[PDB]
Amino acid sequence: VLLLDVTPLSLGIETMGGVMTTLIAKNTTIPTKHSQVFSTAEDNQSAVTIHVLQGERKRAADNKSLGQFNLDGINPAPRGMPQIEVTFDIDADGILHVSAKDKNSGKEQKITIKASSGLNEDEIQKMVRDAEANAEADRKFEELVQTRNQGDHLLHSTRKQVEEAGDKLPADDKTAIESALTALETALKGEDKAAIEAKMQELAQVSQKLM
């Protein structure tokens, strides 16, 4: 064939820390269907937001928003335990169906996105050029968010481990840990990946007693 229908830009959702995660790559022939399992960002999370995006940027904010919906009623559990199946299905007419289903509860929510939605030809070409001109920066952003999410998860895990230990943790140890948790919390608000990792290292250096 010399011609066929494609979806012109990548399609996906916003994940923890403002990153776009792709479900359907740009230029995929349509009709197409792809599913991916996601989970919760923190412990005891009973609801997730499914924000549908079109574009090639790593920051969710830089892509075209196609719509959003919430999935509620997830049983509060440790982070990473829920299995949230997200499906993107584009039919032959270019109509996009997005669904999210929590495997444990059976709870499901969906949205239908019209084929006329998203970016036009000129905006598509600008999107592609802007992504290539910002490839290094977008990569650094993505690496920064992965570190931030690890740091955020370390902050929560340490805090829970401290309370679970309680009296067994010596005074001098507990104070050094609380001070390093504050230094990590501050570093997480910045955009320097190595500064966050160094604060995670300093926290680990004062946390041997909890281990």
Binding site: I13, E14, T15, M16, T21, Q36, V37, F38, S39, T40, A41, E42, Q45, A47, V48, T49, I50, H51, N70, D72, R79, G80, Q83, I84, N149
Partner: peptide
Amino acid sequence: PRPLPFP
């Protein structure tokens, strides 16, 4: 699995 934001 990748994490999702909460409402």
